[PDB]
Amino acid sequence: MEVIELNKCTSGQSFEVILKPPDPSLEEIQKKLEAAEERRKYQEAELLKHLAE
Amino acid sequence: MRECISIHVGQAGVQIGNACWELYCLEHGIQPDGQMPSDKTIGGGDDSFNTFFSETGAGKHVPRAVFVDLEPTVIDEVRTGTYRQLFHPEQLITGKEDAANNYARGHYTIGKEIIDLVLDRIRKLADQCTGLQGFLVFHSFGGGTGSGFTSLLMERLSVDYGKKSKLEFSIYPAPQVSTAVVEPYNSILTTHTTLEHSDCAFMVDNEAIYDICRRNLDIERPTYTNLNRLISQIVSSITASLRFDGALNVDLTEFQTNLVPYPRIHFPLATYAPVISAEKAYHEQLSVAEITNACFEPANQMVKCDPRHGKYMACCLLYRGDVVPKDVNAAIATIKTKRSIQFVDWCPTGFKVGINYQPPTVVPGGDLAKVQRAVCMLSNTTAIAEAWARLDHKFDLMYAKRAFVHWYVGEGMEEGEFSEAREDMAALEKDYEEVGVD
Amino acid sequence: MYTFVVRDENSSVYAEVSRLLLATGQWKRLRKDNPRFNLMLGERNRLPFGRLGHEPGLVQLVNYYRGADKLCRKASLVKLIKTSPELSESCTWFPESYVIYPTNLTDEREVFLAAYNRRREGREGNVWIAKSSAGAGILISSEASELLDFIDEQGQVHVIQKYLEKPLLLEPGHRKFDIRSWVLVDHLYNIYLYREGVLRTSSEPYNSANFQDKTCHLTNHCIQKEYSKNYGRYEEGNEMFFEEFNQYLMDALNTTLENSILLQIKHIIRSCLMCIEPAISTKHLHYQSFQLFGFDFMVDEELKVWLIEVNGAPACAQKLYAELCQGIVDVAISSVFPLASIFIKLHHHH
Amino acid sequence: MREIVHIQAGQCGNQIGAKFWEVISDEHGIDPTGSYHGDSDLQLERINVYYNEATGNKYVPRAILVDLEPGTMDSVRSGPFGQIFRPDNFVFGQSGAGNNWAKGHYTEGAELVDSVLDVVRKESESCDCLQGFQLTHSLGGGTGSGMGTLLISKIREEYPDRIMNTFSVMPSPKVSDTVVEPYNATLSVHQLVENTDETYCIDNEALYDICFRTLKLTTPTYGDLNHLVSATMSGVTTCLRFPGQLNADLRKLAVNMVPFPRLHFFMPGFAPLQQYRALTVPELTQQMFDSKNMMAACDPRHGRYLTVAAIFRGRMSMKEVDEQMLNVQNKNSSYFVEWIPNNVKTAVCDIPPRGLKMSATFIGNSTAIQELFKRISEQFTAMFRRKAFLHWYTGEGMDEMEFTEAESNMNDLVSEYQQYQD
Ligand SMILES: Nc1nc2c(ncn2[C@@H]2O[C@H](COP(=O)(O)OP(=O)(O)OP(=O)(O)O)[C@@H](O)[C@H]2O)c(=O)[nH]1
Ligand SMILES: Nc1ncnc2c1ncn2[C@@H]1O[C@H](COP(=O)(O)OP(=O)(O)CP(=O)(O)O)[C@@H](O)[C@H]1O
Ligand SMILES: Nc1nc2c(ncn2[C@@H]2O[C@H](COP(=O)(O)OP(=O)(O)O)[C@@H](O)[C@H]2O)c(=O)[nH]1
Ligand SMILES: CNC(=O)c1ccc(S(N)(=O)=O)cc1
Ligand SMILES: [Ca+2]
Ligand SMILES: [Ca+2]
Ligand SMILES: [Ca+2]
Ligand SMILES: [Mg+2]
Ligand SMILES: [Mg+2]
Ligand SMILES: [Mg+2]
């Protein structure tokens, strides 16, 4: 039962009590987005082509 | 002094953000027009509240906040609300049609054509920061914007702000206040793409906040206002160290050092008390040993789980009110002799305690009653993985039949990103078990 | 109309509760994966407790106390007793035991040999027994070299305890036996003891000069009906009940079953459950738990009771399925989902 | 401001769609001239979803009336709220369709579809943000069925990423104008399966049996049946017309109701249907789910619910609403698929319909709808096996090959509903 790192100020105080010792770059993100945009455009095309038929 | 920027995404994040900043102003003595009489330094100063508020020559204290919703209905409430004067239009961004509860639609479809705008509006606040600390990101798991667009926003912030910290306040999906069948899909999709980009995440299960409102406040059917007023109280206690003089959790970097030894396990469990109904004429004011004791009952955990059948990796106690360290230790001792607090063998068995003398401020007219002392405990327990096991389970039930998958594939997302995200959660549950079970 | 699910097809005890539940016309059974249920008869190993108590407007009940494995596992029960102050290493009703990990994997090897070398030096009875949870695999021997050599031949955790060299023998026959008491714990943590126990007796004369033949030493219902040549001779199915056993105790030893034995059993159950209550209680939990336990006791020639092991998924004696099961529904299930005592309450402090 | 464009085509479509605008215009405080005379601000909160705001504070519905003969639409222009519609939005011919899908889809309808779309574009070009379109029509006729589907096929071409919602009326031999209605229905069904997101199946047979038995009406009329459609349509649109958070728009609704693209045919229902008695929230639910309050003429106990969307209207204990809904799920969970958690959502609306203390509307994506396409396909094959009545169509340019294809496009639709019921 030890109390360490005791700090006190006007607005309060804090301390510790011990009981027992013991990414994607900006390029790849644009490609991920343009890749999903391409997959939406391709699907919208197949739809229209189906309607044109 | 170092600044902190708060980002609110989606409906849940914006309304909750509206409740926190409302509370922040009542605590720091900031009026709706942004005036602070107690602030003697006019137009400047590196005080502790200046981490969340900048000052203009006219004396207005402006929150370092940025709201972002893909549909204007929810944010328009803030533009004409009570605290409309605090913000300026730049801080509020709105699209014209939302994501329809579709992660793929919030991340790819609608996200691609508004991300460079949000970043540009955030870049404007960072410029006002002499020494920016990091970001606080509020949002929801089930919402298409709170989930799809947030994971994307996080990915970019790590690119434009590599060395800055990013903390999350996520809303866990709860069917009692949710109107979306695919919210499991969104939660698992966003937690996958956001994991490596979030340094510390506080998960708040609406199901948890819901029952606390019906049990402690006698609200038979709570509204979002009832839920946000409470979530802000918790958030206020967790962020108070950044806004008030002190030495525990004085900047975002200490939230990881003090709560996340293992990076992937960065979801601390929260617990708050006391929650007393203001309708009660008067209530017997609880002591330190009684409020501290409550921190180990499942009834006031932001996520319903059983810490007894887990293991702790860290633990903080945030007191507010008439509390002295003498009574804190006394409570802790008597709690160890009665409770089941199993720590991992590679972490110390201790508690970092912080005490703010100002008692928790209550929203005039709100539901919570004024108490003289209160505490919020942050505990990194392996028990919180139960929430993942539940969510991961529902994900398996729907994806096994590919139900609703076409709405995501239709927005351009790849079906493989589902299993790639699921396999990630499976590894997250495995790490939770490697740490807690024998 | 209540609803329940079933996930342990091999559970014989609850296979009758489900049958009785349906006989009331007020309980509907669902598929083993329908989460909208009132009562779960869950699986033994790896029961998903984390998913219980999250269905809005549904009170859920499960028939296993999360954390009971601390009491029903061989190695677990030992560490629990030595470490728990409520029991202490000085407990008088639990045989001196030690946890021994096989040398291919804390461990109490040396502390076991110390107490062993102290006995061999004191001329006291020094016959031990080894066993594990991964058994149907037991070895009785008086040589510490044999016991340690047998555990290393395995690959799971084992335990060595003092073999009771002086067990109470029934007459006629000169045979060993054990006592099985069924204890039910409801959601309020009330501890009910089934007034009806059973004595799984051995049909072979106890022989203390030959531990190699384990037919007169082990009193399991499957061993006596397999390797014993006098099965069913004295009593039916090698199961004597608290009536026949209570008469014999009065004709021979001039005492009752209640005083000599039943009192100690009611104290062992109290102290075992009260100990782990803070760890498994579901008082303020989102769901509720209740579990049936099967305690196994030994009685020595001094009429002192010892605790062998606890069963978290025990089976009941043939002649006591109807009465007990109905009791489970009255005090454990219907006590939570009322419809439109054969137990002995063991009062305690919560 | 998310706008919806309404379209009603054909005799049945316009009569039905007409009463609809009469029903909601009264709930929103709009008089026959388009002026507002309500007393609650909720009536105007989401008003611009279905109404365009003109000069002098006038509210002009965003509707387009389409038919191939002036007979029906002339009645609309002379009806109660006939003077409220946009005079230009009346697009009609004179030849008529003669209950012939081919004429509505290939010959007569083709000569008028370019003109109907030009008005659709006019309304959309004024929409700040357009959610999608909603169509009212029958499937047994010629105009609404043949041309109606022709419109959708083209509307989806010019607005590929907008929600196409429809109110389709299924024909029944108990209420049939012609013997060829099975042909017309089967043809349109395959078009709805392809180019629509949400289709409210409304079987006249159910509407009939409801009027005969539950409503005790001796001899029903199309007008009687249209009160049910009016009431039904009033409720299913409440999510979109008033302030709410659940199913607030069409795309969100589609996302929470359609787990698979080709299974978007809903079974609607409401309640209530000795009239001055106050109806308790329990009774609203007990009836709301009973098959006799559903306009699909299908026994849900013969199938399973994929999703359900209940909307409650009127000042009531919203706590008592949750309790009761959670009682129907927990006492009949064997009829809800267990591989879709919480597939039942509940929304509350404070503004009740007319003159009712409280009401409840049912929206169900049930596999029992296959029983409906079974009757249609049975009645189709009964004639197509002998080529009976095919000359009315082969004479319009169609081939038996196109019939065989539609016949099989639906048999596939049934098998699809059948593999999920198991
Ligand atoms: N606690 C709390 N939860 C909220 C609040 N608003 C929404 N939620 C939860 O958020 C989840 C859905 O996310 P939303 O924020 O509403 O959706 P979104 O972020 O606007 O994204 P979209 O799909 O485009 O609308 C639901 O499960 C709600 O329970 C709120 O104000 N407080
Ligand atoms: N220390 C000891 N002294 C005497 N006998 C002992 C003993 N330890 C075990 N036994 C014998 O072993 C039997 C209990 O074995 P154990 O309970 O470890 O295996 P098990 O769990 O598979 C049987 P159960 O069906 O009761 O669970 C008893 O019949 C008892 O006679
Ligand atoms: N419920 C209802 N059904 C109708 C109405 N008018 C026609 N029908 C049905 O629609 C089918 C005929 O379609 P019809 O209206 O003639 O199509 P149109 O040629 O486009 O006008 C028949 O099966 C009728 O039963 C109506 O007012 N109400
Ligand atoms: C044959 N005389 C008609 O006037 C006539 C008869 C039938 C049709 S139909 N029903 O469209 O096939 C059209 C017109
Ligand atoms: Ca200042
Ligand atoms: Ca990072
Ligand atoms: Ca012509
Ligand atoms: Mg939203
Ligand atoms: Mg055993
Ligand atoms: Mg007609």
PDB file of N, CA and C in Angstrom, chain D residues 218-282:
ATOM      1  N   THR D 218     -71.821  -6.134 -47.422  1.00  0.00           N
ATOM      2  CA  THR D 218     -72.470  -7.137 -48.256  1.00  0.00           C
ATOM      3  C   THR D 218     -71.837  -7.201 -49.641  1.00  0.00           C
ATOM      4  N   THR D 219     -72.000  -6.140 -50.429  1.00  0.00           N
ATOM      5  CA  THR D 219     -71.472  -6.104 -51.788  1.00  0.00           C
ATOM      6  C   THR D 219     -70.388  -5.041 -51.892  1.00  0.00           C
ATOM      7  N   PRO D 220     -69.120  -5.420 -52.013  1.00  0.00           N
ATOM      8  CA  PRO D 220     -68.050  -4.421 -52.070  1.00  0.00           C
ATOM      9  C   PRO D 220     -67.952  -3.768 -53.441  1.00  0.00           C
ATOM     10  N   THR D 221     -67.319  -2.597 -53.450  1.00  0.00           N
ATOM     11  CA  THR D 221     -67.055  -1.841 -54.664  1.00  0.00           C
ATOM     12  C   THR D 221     -65.570  -1.510 -54.727  1.00  0.00           C
ATOM     13  N   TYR D 222     -65.121  -1.062 -55.903  1.00  0.00           N
ATOM     14  CA  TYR D 222     -63.756  -0.558 -56.003  1.00  0.00           C
ATOM     15  C   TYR D 222     -63.549   0.646 -55.096  1.00  0.00           C
ATOM     16  N   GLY D 223     -64.586   1.466 -54.912  1.00  0.00           N
ATOM     17  CA  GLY D 223     -64.478   2.577 -53.982  1.00  0.00           C
ATOM     18  C   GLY D 223     -64.251   2.115 -52.556  1.00  0.00           C
ATOM     19  N   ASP D 224     -65.002   1.102 -52.120  1.00  0.00           N
ATOM     20  CA  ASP D 224     -64.787   0.539 -50.790  1.00  0.00           C
ATOM     21  C   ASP D 224     -63.358   0.036 -50.640  1.00  0.00           C
ATOM     22  N   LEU D 225     -62.869  -0.705 -51.638  1.00  0.00           N
ATOM     23  CA  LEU D 225     -61.509  -1.227 -51.579  1.00  0.00           C
ATOM     24  C   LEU D 225     -60.479  -0.110 -51.503  1.00  0.00           C
ATOM     25  N   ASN D 226     -60.797   1.066 -52.048  1.00  0.00           N
ATOM     26  CA  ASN D 226     -59.820   2.144 -52.100  1.00  0.00           C
ATOM     27  C   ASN D 226     -59.674   2.878 -50.773  1.00  0.00           C
ATOM     28  N   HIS D 227     -60.685   2.830 -49.900  1.00  0.00           N
ATOM     29  CA  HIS D 227     -60.486   3.329 -48.543  1.00  0.00           C
ATOM     30  C   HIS D 227     -59.382   2.551 -47.841  1.00  0.00           C
ATOM     31  N   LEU D 228     -59.349   1.231 -48.037  1.00  0.00           N
ATOM     32  CA  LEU D 228     -58.286   0.421 -47.454  1.00  0.00           C
ATOM     33  C   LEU D 228     -56.926   0.823 -48.013  1.00  0.00           C
ATOM     34  N   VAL D 229     -56.830   0.965 -49.338  1.00  0.00           N
ATOM     35  CA  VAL D 229     -55.578   1.408 -49.942  1.00  0.00           C
ATOM     36  C   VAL D 229     -55.213   2.799 -49.444  1.00  0.00           C
ATOM     37  N   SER D 230     -56.191   3.707 -49.408  1.00  0.00           N
ATOM     38  CA  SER D 230     -55.941   5.047 -48.889  1.00  0.00           C
ATOM     39  C   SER D 230     -55.394   4.985 -47.471  1.00  0.00           C
ATOM     40  N   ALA D 231     -56.092   4.273 -46.583  1.00  0.00           N
ATOM     41  CA  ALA D 231     -55.613   4.120 -45.215  1.00  0.00           C
ATOM     42  C   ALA D 231     -54.228   3.486 -45.193  1.00  0.00           C
ATOM     43  N   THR D 232     -54.058   2.372 -45.907  1.00  0.00           N
ATOM     44  CA  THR D 232     -52.756   1.713 -45.956  1.00  0.00           C
ATOM     45  C   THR D 232     -51.673   2.672 -46.438  1.00  0.00           C
ATOM     46  N   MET D 233     -51.916   3.342 -47.567  1.00  0.00           N
ATOM     47  CA  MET D 233     -50.922   4.264 -48.106  1.00  0.00           C
ATOM     48  C   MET D 233     -50.643   5.414 -47.149  1.00  0.00           C
ATOM     49  N   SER D 234     -51.660   5.871 -46.418  1.00  0.00           N
ATOM     50  CA  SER D 234     -51.444   6.945 -45.457  1.00  0.00           C
ATOM     51  C   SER D 234     -50.405   6.548 -44.419  1.00  0.00           C
ATOM     52  N   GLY D 235     -50.485   5.314 -43.916  1.00  0.00           N
ATOM     53  CA  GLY D 235     -49.591   4.901 -42.845  1.00  0.00           C
ATOM     54  C   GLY D 235     -48.171   4.659 -43.319  1.00  0.00           C
ATOM     55  N   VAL D 236     -48.014   3.871 -44.387  1.00  0.00           N
ATOM     56  CA  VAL D 236     -46.683   3.517 -44.867  1.00  0.00           C
ATOM     57  C   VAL D 236     -45.856   4.745 -45.222  1.00  0.00           C
ATOM     58  N   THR D 237     -46.501   5.877 -45.493  1.00  0.00           N
ATOM     59  CA  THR D 237     -45.798   7.116 -45.795  1.00  0.00           C
ATOM     60  C   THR D 237     -45.626   8.011 -44.576  1.00  0.00           C
ATOM     61  N   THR D 238     -46.174   7.619 -43.422  1.00  0.00           N
ATOM     62  CA  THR D 238     -46.049   8.447 -42.226  1.00  0.00           C
ATOM     63  C   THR D 238     -44.588   8.647 -41.846  1.00  0.00           C
ATOM     64  N   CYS D 239     -43.763   7.609 -42.017  1.00  0.00           N
ATOM     65  CA  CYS D 239     -42.338   7.742 -41.726  1.00  0.00           C
ATOM     66  C   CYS D 239     -41.723   8.898 -42.503  1.00  0.00           C
ATOM     67  N   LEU D 240     -42.199   9.128 -43.727  1.00  0.00           N
ATOM     68  CA  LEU D 240     -41.627  10.140 -44.603  1.00  0.00           C
ATOM     69  C   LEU D 240     -42.278  11.506 -44.447  1.00  0.00           C
ATOM     70  N   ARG D 241     -43.505  11.566 -43.927  1.00  0.00           N
ATOM     71  CA  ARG D 241     -44.265  12.809 -43.908  1.00  0.00           C
ATOM     72  C   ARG D 241     -44.137  13.586 -42.606  1.00  0.00           C
ATOM     73  N   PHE D 242     -43.821  12.922 -41.497  1.00  0.00           N
ATOM     74  CA  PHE D 242     -43.778  13.623 -40.221  1.00  0.00           C
ATOM     75  C   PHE D 242     -42.393  13.530 -39.594  1.00  0.00           C
ATOM     76  N   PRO D 243     -42.125  14.296 -38.539  1.00  0.00           N
ATOM     77  CA  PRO D 243     -40.816  14.206 -37.883  1.00  0.00           C
ATOM     78  C   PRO D 243     -40.602  12.818 -37.298  1.00  0.00           C
ATOM     79  N   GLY D 244     -39.474  12.213 -37.649  1.00  0.00           N
ATOM     80  CA  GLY D 244     -39.164  10.879 -37.177  1.00  0.00           C
ATOM     81  C   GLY D 244     -37.725  10.525 -37.465  1.00  0.00           C
ATOM     82  N   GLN D 245     -37.241   9.515 -36.743  1.00  0.00           N
ATOM     83  CA  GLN D 245     -35.870   9.047 -36.881  1.00  0.00           C
ATOM     84  C   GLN D 245     -35.753   7.681 -37.537  1.00  0.00           C
ATOM     85  N   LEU D 246     -36.796   6.859 -37.484  1.00  0.00           N
ATOM     86  CA  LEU D 246     -36.785   5.533 -38.084  1.00  0.00           C
ATOM     87  C   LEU D 246     -37.405   5.589 -39.474  1.00  0.00           C
ATOM     88  N   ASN D 247     -36.720   4.994 -40.449  1.00  0.00           N
ATOM     89  CA  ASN D 247     -37.199   4.941 -41.831  1.00  0.00           C
ATOM     90  C   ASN D 247     -37.633   6.325 -42.311  1.00  0.00           C
ATOM     91  N   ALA D 248     -36.774   7.316 -42.052  1.00  0.00           N
ATOM     92  CA  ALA D 248     -37.120   8.702 -42.352  1.00  0.00           C
ATOM     93  C   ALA D 248     -37.172   8.970 -43.851  1.00  0.00           C
ATOM     94  N   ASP D 249     -36.428   8.209 -44.652  1.00  0.00           N
ATOM     95  CA  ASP D 249     -36.411   8.385 -46.098  1.00  0.00           C
ATOM     96  C   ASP D 249     -36.548   7.024 -46.770  1.00  0.00           C
ATOM     97  N   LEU D 250     -36.560   7.035 -48.103  1.00  0.00           N
ATOM     98  CA  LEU D 250     -36.819   5.808 -48.847  1.00  0.00           C
ATOM     99  C   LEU D 250     -35.609   4.883 -48.865  1.00  0.00           C
ATOM    100  N   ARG D 251     -34.408   5.437 -49.040  1.00  0.00           N
ATOM    101  CA  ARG D 251     -33.222   4.592 -49.117  1.00  0.00           C
ATOM    102  C   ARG D 251     -32.941   3.912 -47.782  1.00  0.00           C
ATOM    103  N   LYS D 252     -33.071   4.645 -46.673  1.00  0.00           N
ATOM    104  CA  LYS D 252     -32.934   4.012 -45.365  1.00  0.00           C
ATOM    105  C   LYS D 252     -33.961   2.902 -45.186  1.00  0.00           C
ATOM    106  N   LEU D 253     -35.202   3.144 -45.612  1.00  0.00           N
ATOM    107  CA  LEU D 253     -36.227   2.111 -45.525  1.00  0.00           C
ATOM    108  C   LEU D 253     -35.838   0.889 -46.347  1.00  0.00           C
ATOM    109  N   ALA D 254     -35.383   1.108 -47.581  1.00  0.00           N
ATOM    110  CA  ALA D 254     -34.982  -0.014 -48.424  1.00  0.00           C
ATOM    111  C   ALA D 254     -33.847  -0.804 -47.783  1.00  0.00           C
ATOM    112  N   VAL D 255     -32.915  -0.111 -47.123  1.00  0.00           N
ATOM    113  CA  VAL D 255     -31.754  -0.784 -46.550  1.00  0.00           C
ATOM    114  C   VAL D 255     -32.152  -1.672 -45.378  1.00  0.00           C
ATOM    115  N   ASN D 256     -33.191  -1.298 -44.638  1.00  0.00           N
ATOM    116  CA  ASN D 256     -33.620  -2.051 -43.467  1.00  0.00           C
ATOM    117  C   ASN D 256     -34.704  -3.076 -43.771  1.00  0.00           C
ATOM    118  N   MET D 257     -35.143  -3.182 -45.027  1.00  0.00           N
ATOM    119  CA  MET D 257     -36.211  -4.099 -45.394  1.00  0.00           C
ATOM    120  C   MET D 257     -35.835  -5.093 -46.480  1.00  0.00           C
ATOM    121  N   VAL D 258     -34.780  -4.838 -47.248  1.00  0.00           N
ATOM    122  CA  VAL D 258     -34.452  -5.682 -48.394  1.00  0.00           C
ATOM    123  C   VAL D 258     -33.069  -6.297 -48.208  1.00  0.00           C
ATOM    124  N   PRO D 259     -32.963  -7.487 -47.611  1.00  0.00           N
ATOM    125  CA  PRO D 259     -31.649  -8.140 -47.518  1.00  0.00           C
ATOM    126  C   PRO D 259     -31.151  -8.677 -48.847  1.00  0.00           C
ATOM    127  N   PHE D 260     -32.035  -8.871 -49.824  1.00  0.00           N
ATOM    128  CA  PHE D 260     -31.660  -9.387 -51.127  1.00  0.00           C
ATOM    129  C   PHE D 260     -32.384  -8.584 -52.198  1.00  0.00           C
ATOM    130  N   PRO D 261     -31.699  -8.245 -53.293  1.00  0.00           N
ATOM    131  CA  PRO D 261     -32.262  -7.254 -54.228  1.00  0.00           C
ATOM    132  C   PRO D 261     -33.602  -7.648 -54.831  1.00  0.00           C
ATOM    133  N   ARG D 262     -33.802  -8.923 -55.152  1.00  0.00           N
ATOM    134  CA  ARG D 262     -35.002  -9.354 -55.859  1.00  0.00           C
ATOM    135  C   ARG D 262     -36.159  -9.715 -54.935  1.00  0.00           C
ATOM    136  N   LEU D 263     -35.996  -9.583 -53.625  1.00  0.00           N
ATOM    137  CA  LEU D 263     -37.043  -9.910 -52.659  1.00  0.00           C
ATOM    138  C   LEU D 263     -37.452  -8.624 -51.940  1.00  0.00           C
ATOM    139  N   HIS D 264     -38.169  -7.752 -52.653  1.00  0.00           N
ATOM    140  CA  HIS D 264     -38.565  -6.450 -52.134  1.00  0.00           C
ATOM    141  C   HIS D 264     -40.073  -6.242 -52.235  1.00  0.00           C
ATOM    142  N   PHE D 265     -40.855  -7.312 -52.088  1.00  0.00           N
ATOM    143  CA  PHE D 265     -42.313  -7.249 -52.150  1.00  0.00           C
ATOM    144  C   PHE D 265     -42.865  -7.395 -50.736  1.00  0.00           C
ATOM    145  N   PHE D 266     -43.450  -6.317 -50.220  1.00  0.00           N
ATOM    146  CA  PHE D 266     -43.874  -6.237 -48.830  1.00  0.00           C
ATOM    147  C   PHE D 266     -45.342  -6.616 -48.669  1.00  0.00           C
ATOM    148  N   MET D 267     -45.663  -7.179 -47.500  1.00  0.00           N
ATOM    149  CA  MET D 267     -47.039  -7.461 -47.120  1.00  0.00           C
ATOM    150  C   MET D 267     -47.507  -6.397 -46.142  1.00  0.00           C
ATOM    151  N   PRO D 268     -48.381  -5.481 -46.543  1.00  0.00           N
ATOM    152  CA  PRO D 268     -48.813  -4.410 -45.646  1.00  0.00           C
ATOM    153  C   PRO D 268     -50.042  -4.804 -44.832  1.00  0.00           C
ATOM    154  N   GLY D 269     -50.357  -3.958 -43.861  1.00  0.00           N
ATOM    155  CA  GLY D 269     -51.517  -4.175 -43.014  1.00  0.00           C
ATOM    156  C   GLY D 269     -51.590  -3.100 -41.953  1.00  0.00           C
ATOM    157  N   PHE D 270     -52.801  -2.902 -41.437  1.00  0.00           N
ATOM    158  CA  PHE D 270     -53.021  -1.902 -40.403  1.00  0.00           C
ATOM    159  C   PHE D 270     -54.218  -2.312 -39.554  1.00  0.00           C
ATOM    160  N   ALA D 271     -54.521  -1.486 -38.562  1.00  0.00           N
ATOM    161  CA  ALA D 271     -55.665  -1.682 -37.685  1.00  0.00           C
ATOM    162  C   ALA D 271     -55.906  -0.382 -36.920  1.00  0.00           C
ATOM    163  N   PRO D 272     -57.147  -0.147 -36.466  1.00  0.00           N
ATOM    164  CA  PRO D 272     -58.282  -1.059 -36.630  1.00  0.00           C
ATOM    165  C   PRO D 272     -58.884  -0.982 -38.028  1.00  0.00           C
ATOM    166  N   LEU D 273     -59.974  -1.706 -38.262  1.00  0.00           N
ATOM    167  CA  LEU D 273     -60.637  -1.682 -39.563  1.00  0.00           C
ATOM    168  C   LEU D 273     -62.010  -1.020 -39.475  1.00  0.00           C
ATOM    169  N   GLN D 274     -70.654  -0.118 -32.410  1.00  0.00           N
ATOM    170  CA  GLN D 274     -69.483  -0.712 -31.775  1.00  0.00           C
ATOM    171  C   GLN D 274     -68.193  -0.070 -32.270  1.00  0.00           C
ATOM    172  N   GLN D 275     -68.331   1.072 -32.941  1.00  0.00           N
ATOM    173  CA  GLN D 275     -67.190   1.778 -33.505  1.00  0.00           C
ATOM    174  C   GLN D 275     -66.599   2.816 -32.562  1.00  0.00           C
ATOM    175  N   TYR D 276     -67.358   3.268 -31.567  1.00  0.00           N
ATOM    176  CA  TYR D 276     -66.911   4.317 -30.658  1.00  0.00           C
ATOM    177  C   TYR D 276     -66.053   3.788 -29.515  1.00  0.00           C
ATOM    178  N   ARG D 277     -65.597   2.543 -29.595  1.00  0.00           N
ATOM    179  CA  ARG D 277     -64.821   1.943 -28.519  1.00  0.00           C
ATOM    180  C   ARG D 277     -63.356   2.343 -28.618  1.00  0.00           C
ATOM    181  N   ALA D 278     -62.773   2.703 -27.476  1.00  0.00           N
ATOM    182  CA  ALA D 278     -61.348   2.997 -27.424  1.00  0.00           C
ATOM    183  C   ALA D 278     -60.549   1.705 -27.554  1.00  0.00           C
ATOM    184  N   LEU D 279     -59.593   1.693 -28.479  1.00  0.00           N
ATOM    185  CA  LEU D 279     -58.820   0.499 -28.790  1.00  0.00           C
ATOM    186  C   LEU D 279     -57.490   0.552 -28.046  1.00  0.00           C
ATOM    187  N   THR D 280     -57.241  -0.451 -27.207  1.00  0.00           N
ATOM    188  CA  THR D 280     -56.009  -0.502 -26.435  1.00  0.00           C
ATOM    189  C   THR D 280     -54.823  -0.866 -27.325  1.00  0.00           C
ATOM    190  N   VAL D 281     -53.629  -0.471 -26.874  1.00  0.00           N
ATOM    191  CA  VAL D 281     -52.410  -0.817 -27.609  1.00  0.00           C
ATOM    192  C   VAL D 281     -52.277  -2.322 -27.781  1.00  0.00           C
ATOM    193  N   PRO D 282     -52.635  -3.163 -26.807  1.00  0.00           N
ATOM    194  CA  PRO D 282     -52.599  -4.614 -27.068  1.00  0.00           C
ATOM    195  C   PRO D 282     -53.466  -5.026 -28.245  1.00  0.00           C
TER     196      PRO D 282
END
